[PDB]
Design a protein around this motif. Structure first.
Motif, short mmCIF file in Angstrom:
data_model
loop_
_atom_site.label_atom_id
_atom_site.label_comp_id
_atom_site.label_asym_id
_atom_site.label_seq_id
_atom_site.Cartn_x
_atom_site.Cartn_y
_atom_site.Cartn_z
N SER A 157 0.83 -1.20 0.00
CA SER A 157 0.00 0.00 0.00
C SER A 157 0.86 1.25 0.00
N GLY A 158 1.92 1.22 0.78
CA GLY A 158 2.84 2.34 0.86
C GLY A 158 3.53 2.61 -0.45
N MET A 159 3.85 1.54 -1.17
CA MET A 159 4.58 1.65 -2.43
C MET A 159 3.91 2.64 -3.37
N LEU A 160 2.59 2.72 -3.29
CA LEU A 160 1.81 3.58 -4.17
C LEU A 160 2.09 5.07 -3.98
N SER A 161 2.11 5.80 -5.10
CA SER A 161 2.36 7.23 -5.08
C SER A 161 1.30 7.97 -5.88
N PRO A 162 0.07 8.12 -5.27
CA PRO A 162 -0.93 8.81 -6.09
C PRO A 162 -1.29 10.19 -5.57
N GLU A 163 -1.32 11.17 -6.47
CA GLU A 163 -1.74 12.52 -6.14
C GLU A 163 -3.00 12.70 -6.97
N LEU A 164 -4.13 12.89 -6.31
CA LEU A 164 -5.39 13.03 -7.04
C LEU A 164 -5.91 14.46 -7.18
N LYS A 165 -5.15 15.40 -6.62
CA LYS A 165 -5.48 16.82 -6.62
C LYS A 165 -4.88 17.48 -5.37
N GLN A 166 -4.50 18.75 -5.47
CA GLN A 166 -3.90 19.46 -4.34
C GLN A 166 -4.78 20.60 -3.83
N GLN A 167 -4.34 21.22 -2.74
CA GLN A 167 -5.07 22.33 -2.13
C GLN A 167 -4.42 23.66 -2.46
N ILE A 168 -5.17 24.56 -3.10
CA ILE A 168 -4.59 25.86 -3.42
C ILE A 168 -3.95 26.46 -2.18
N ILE A 169 -2.82 27.14 -2.35
CA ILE A 169 -2.17 27.74 -1.20
C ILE A 169 -2.73 29.14 -1.13
N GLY A 170 -2.83 29.76 -2.30
CA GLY A 170 -3.37 31.10 -2.41
C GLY A 170 -3.89 31.36 -3.81
N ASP A 228 -7.78 38.27 -15.34
CA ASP A 228 -7.51 36.87 -15.07
C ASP A 228 -6.99 36.68 -13.64
N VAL A 229 -7.09 35.46 -13.13
CA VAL A 229 -6.64 35.16 -11.78
C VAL A 229 -5.68 33.98 -11.78
N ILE A 230 -4.60 34.10 -11.01
CA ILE A 230 -3.61 33.04 -10.90
C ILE A 230 -3.85 32.23 -9.64
N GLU A 231 -3.92 30.91 -9.79
CA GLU A 231 -4.17 30.02 -8.66
C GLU A 231 -2.93 29.23 -8.28
N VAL A 232 -2.35 29.55 -7.13
CA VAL A 232 -1.21 28.81 -6.62
C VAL A 232 -1.69 27.71 -5.67
N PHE A 233 -1.08 26.53 -5.78
CA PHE A 233 -1.48 25.40 -4.96
C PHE A 233 -0.28 24.57 -4.52
N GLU A 234 -0.32 24.12 -3.27
CA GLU A 234 0.74 23.30 -2.71
C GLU A 234 0.52 21.86 -3.12
N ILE A 235 1.59 21.08 -3.14
CA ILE A 235 1.49 19.67 -3.50
C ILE A 235 1.96 18.80 -2.34
#
Lengths: 91, 119, 123, 71
Positions: free
Chosen positions: B20-33, B112-119
RNA sequence: AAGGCGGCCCCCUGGACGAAGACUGACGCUCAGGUGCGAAAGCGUGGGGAGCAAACAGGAUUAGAUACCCUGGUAGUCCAC
RNA sequence: GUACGGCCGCAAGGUUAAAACUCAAAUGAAUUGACGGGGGCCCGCACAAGCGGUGGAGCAUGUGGUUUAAUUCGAUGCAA
RNA sequence: CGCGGGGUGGAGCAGCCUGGUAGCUCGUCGGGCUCAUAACCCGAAGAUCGUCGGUUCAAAUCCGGCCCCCGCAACCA
């Protein structure tokens, strides 16, 4: 006036050999000549995608201080491609 | 690693755990600002500096950004330089005047608006 | 030359340096296959020669030839190696023993079978 | 005998390495060390650093291939 | 002895060779280690500096020419230790 | 004649002096050619001495290239 | 309305205050050298000298406009 002198940059002219004669090519420009780069490919009417525009482009980009180039030509005529390089033009 | 197990049940569980740990999935991140840019400025290095005003969150340096106009994303990238005035601070909070520039982004338009997000 | 000289410094035979040190004077050694790949040979030859890197039971890690036509070997294959260089493959100083441990015999061999780990075909 | 797991896929000469050696990039996926086929070298047939070429690849080592078809 | 030593004069000094006979009486040969000598370039201090000339600059040649050729020219080449 | 160690040197460096690894060679002298803008001697319309040309022009002709449905195949430095 | 230096051949110059067929380099196309290529050598092609009005015997070079490029300049978060 402004003369035409010339330098060449053949393939296998990299950093070593190269920027030594980028020093030579400064010298040409810095006399107040229009220093014409001639590529001389081991090649054809399209020799390269490598040979020319690494060299030429980095010659511009390194010399960019003192010299700039008239054109980034990338139309080879024969088995050789002139990039024309001049004094950087005062506006 | 040397591990001995008295029962097979404790073994069958942990091997799965290793898997289970072996897996590396990122399904979406949370905007930082999220910030909107206005009154573009010109810079020799990056080619452009877009003046910004952060409406929400905190803007950070190395965190990736999503540039979108009219709800669709015009461009994407990761910030190279975050600079306010001559300070060049690595972090900018919300409702504080801020400045931004990035390489390989040609056209800056207002609204326009720029969306920054942490990973 | 002088007798006097030899009396001060005796004749001293050179000690032979080995060509298969990884074997450490053993007839074969066992080892695990680290990499299994092909490589091209030296002037004037040309091919895709099968070799493997093998970590031996004594710590040495060497490249070894996998002779014969066809082999079913991969990483973690446990094989037996013997002395024997491959001449147009510099660095290669050992041969893999076909038909020992995890290494299978050559398929369909009829001549020189014992050098390729092949049983005598019922006939 | 000679197995038959060989292939003839094509590609383009990339680098002009030493001793009839090339970077030949397979139209397929990547590029391999590609050496000039004996035949080809015997019949000369120089080979510029940017030609469409045929390669013989042994699954044994996909990393390598021989140039068969001259251009 | 080797490195090497060349205008002329003097002073101090080493070696070689010849002639004749007297003296000593094997005191000889070689030599690991040891010691001394050892072109040029190079190094340190202070002198000296005409010519030559690494480096370096400029002019040419050349596809390029960090060279060969030309105009200059610093160390160095000279003296003492 | 490299590394490590030792001794030596202000330094540049010197001296003593290995092993792994890699190849089936490396090397000496002489021989027969070939080659030389290394050398010597010597020849040929090779130069030199001459007379007339080709390179320019128009046309004939061959080739390359380009074109084409096809412009059939071969000859390609002196020696196409 | 706001500074600098330039416009000549395909590209870059010289010919400028010293006003009488515009020459000098790199490219272009040929020729020569080589067994051949690179390199090099002999050569030819190639122009309203930005564009106009002034001014003059004849103005490339003479003045000023139109206009263009570069220069820094101005947008230097």
């Amino acid at each position: 006036v402004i003369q035409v002198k010339e330098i060449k940059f053949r393939p296998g002219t990299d950093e070593g050999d190269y920027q030594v004669k980028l020093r030579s090519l400064i010298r040409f420009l810095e006399e107040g000549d229009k220093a014409k780069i001639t590529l001389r490919f081991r090649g054809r009417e399209m020799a390269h995608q490598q040979i020319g525009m690494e060299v030429l482009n980095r010659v511009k980009d390194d010399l960019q201080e003192l010299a700039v180039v008239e054109s980034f030509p990338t139309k080879i005529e024969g088995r050789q491609m002139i990039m024309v390089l001049a004094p950087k033009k005062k506006q | 690693d040397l591990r001995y197990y008295s029962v097979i049940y404790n073994l069958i569980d942990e091997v799965k755990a290793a898997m289970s740990g072996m897996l590396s999935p990122e399904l979406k991140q949370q905007i930082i600002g999220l910030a909107e840019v206005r009154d573009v400025f010109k810079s020799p290095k990056f080619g452009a500096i877009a003046g910004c005003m952060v409406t929400e969150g905190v803007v950070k340096r190395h965190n990736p950004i999503r540039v979108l106009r009219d709800n669709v994303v015009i461009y994407e990238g990761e910030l190279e330089s975050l600079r306010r005035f001559k300070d060049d601070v690595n972090e900018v909070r919300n409702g504080m005047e801020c400045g931004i520039g990035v390489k390989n982004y040609n056209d800056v338009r207002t609204g326009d608006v720029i969306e920054v997000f942490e990973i | 030359a002088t007798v006097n000289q030899l009396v001060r410094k005796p004749r001293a035979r050179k000690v032979a340096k080995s060509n298969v040190p990884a074997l450490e004077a053993c007839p074969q050694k066992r080892g695990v296959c680290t990499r299994v790949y092909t490589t091209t040979p030296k002037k004037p030859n040309s091919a895709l020669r099968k070799v493997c890197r093998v970590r031996l039971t004594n710590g040495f890690e060497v490249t070894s030839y996998i002779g014969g036509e066809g082999h079913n070997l991969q990483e973690h294959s446990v094989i037996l190696i013997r002395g024997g260089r491959v001449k147009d493959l510099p660095g290669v100083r050992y041969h893999t023993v076909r038909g020992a441990l995890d290494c299978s015999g050559v398929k369909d061999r009829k001549q020189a079978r014992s050098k390729y780990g092949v049983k005598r075909p019922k006939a | 005998a000679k197995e038959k797991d060989t292939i003839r896929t094509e590609g383009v000469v990339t680098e002009a390495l030493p001793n009839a050696t090339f970077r030949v990039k397979l139209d397929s996926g990547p590029e391999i060390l590609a050496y000039i086929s004996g035949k080809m070298r015997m019949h000369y047939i120089r080979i510029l650093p940017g030609d469409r070429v045929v390669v013989e690849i042994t699954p044994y080592d996909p990393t390598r291939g021989r140039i068969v078809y001259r251009k």
